[PDB]
Design a protein around this ligand. Sequence first.
Ligand SMILES: Nc1nc2c(ncn2[C@@H]2O[C@H](COP(=O)(O)OP(=O)(O)O)[C@@H](O)[C@H]2O)c(=O)[nH]1
Ligand SMILES: *C/C=C(\C)CC/C=C(\C)CCC=C(C)C
Ligand SMILES: [Mg+2]
Lengths: 171, 147
Amino acid sequence: PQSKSRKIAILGYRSVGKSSLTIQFVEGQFVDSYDPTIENTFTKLITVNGQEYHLQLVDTAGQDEYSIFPQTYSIDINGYILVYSVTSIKSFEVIKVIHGKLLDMVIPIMLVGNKKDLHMERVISYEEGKALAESWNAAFLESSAKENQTAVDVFRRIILEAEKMQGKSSC
Amino acid sequence: KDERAREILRGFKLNWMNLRDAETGKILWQGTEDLSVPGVEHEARVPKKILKCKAVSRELNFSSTEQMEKFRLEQKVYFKGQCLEEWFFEFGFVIPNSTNTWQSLIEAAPESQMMPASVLTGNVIIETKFFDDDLLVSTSRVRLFYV
Ligand SMILES: Nc1nc2c(ncn2[C@@H]2O[C@H](COP(=O)(O)OP(=O)(O)O)[C@@H](O)[C@H]2O)c(=O)[nH]1
Ligand SMILES: *C/C=C(\C)CC/C=C(\C)CCC=C(C)C
Ligand SMILES: [Mg+2]
């Protein structure tokens, strides 16, 4: 196949940078503001090891620790990006809860510590995120939605991990 | 190995084939043309509503004078001459001088991800490679119309 279609769900607490990361990747800009309440799908082509992938990216409207896990975050998903902010302990606590609920529902998973540019506000070390990801047997990256290459790196990585392990469009 | 491949090909034929809605078993399309014959661009006209099935059951009835250890198919779907997707199916052991009905399930992509009939029709070529294990026996092509 010239272009392999994949669907990726982006999960996490409100304000961690889900929309900003996704838009930096898709549009190549740091969006001034994007409605915190809106759940939308983005479409983007990316080449990974010479293979083009056609990405359907579900930018979710964010869950907290008390949220029911939407069945629609589980159907036909090829990979999950779980995002927290390195400046928010709450967001880190919440991503652990989301992960548990995700496993209950269902798996290529990666964990992303966002806002790495905000050095004065950081409260979570790289090493703490990394240790969590290892316990999940998941990939780990830190990112800033203000830095294009770090956003691109996140989406390339989930594809890399997905390919390490069905439905036809013409039939 | 080249000689054995020719022998298998000479003794191999497709007798008939069905496409059925997997849920109901209702036949949507059937043919008796041997679409396995190499070197001819075969054509097939499939009902466009097939793209609305959640899953399709395909029946291939074939005869083989020669024994095969691991009979299998690779089907590459080309859209306007470019690789769109690939389908893989395995039958396994084939008894010499037997006739066999091979049933395969083909699941649809999510509804929002299906290619439209208007785009696909007359622009699809399925290239089928017939293998015994790693030995390429034969290759055929069929152009599809979704009507
Ligand atoms: N400095 C910085 N700010 C960010 C980053 N990502 C998001 N933001 C800001 O954090 C706020 C929430 O971001 P948003 O993408 O809407 O988060 P979402 O609720 O998870 O979709 C916005 O004001 C963004 O501009 C980042 O990597 N660095
Ligand atoms: C729903 C099924 C579609 C659209 C195509 C089914 C395949 C064929 C028709 C061609 C099969 C050809 C061989 C097995 C040689
Ligand atoms: Mg958002």
